[PDB]
Amino acid sequence: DEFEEFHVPERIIDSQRASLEDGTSQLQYLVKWRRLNYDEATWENATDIVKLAPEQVKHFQNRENSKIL
């Protein structure tokens, strides 16, 4: 199925990959849901955002190696 209509991420702003070492790691990407008149953005697993917003996580992924350029 496709769950991407009203609740959809606009793009990534930052990432938070915390290694656990117990057998896995905590990967989370900061996303900004829409723009809204004011603003709105939180943290979500980079795995879900990859499937939920693969185009954004990809553009965000390649950006991780680019500090405003």
Q: What is the DSSP string of 2-69?
A: ---SSS-EEEEEEEEEEE-SSS-EEEEEEEEES--SS---EEEEHHHHHHHSHHHHHHHHHHTT-S--
Confirm if 44 and 50 have CB atoms less than 8 A apart: no
Confirm if 30 and 16 have CB atoms less than 8 A apart: yes
Chain-centroid distance, C-alpha 30 = 5
CA 53 to CA 57: how far, in whole Å?
Answer: 6
Beta strand 9-19 with 25-33 is antiparallel
Structural domain harbouring 63:
1-69
Residues 6 or more apart whose CB falls under 8 angstroms from that of 35 comprise 10
Task: For residue 17, give the CATH number of its domain.
Answer: 2.40.50.40
**Whole-angstrom Cα Rg for the chain:** 13
When divided into structural domains, the chain yields a total of 1
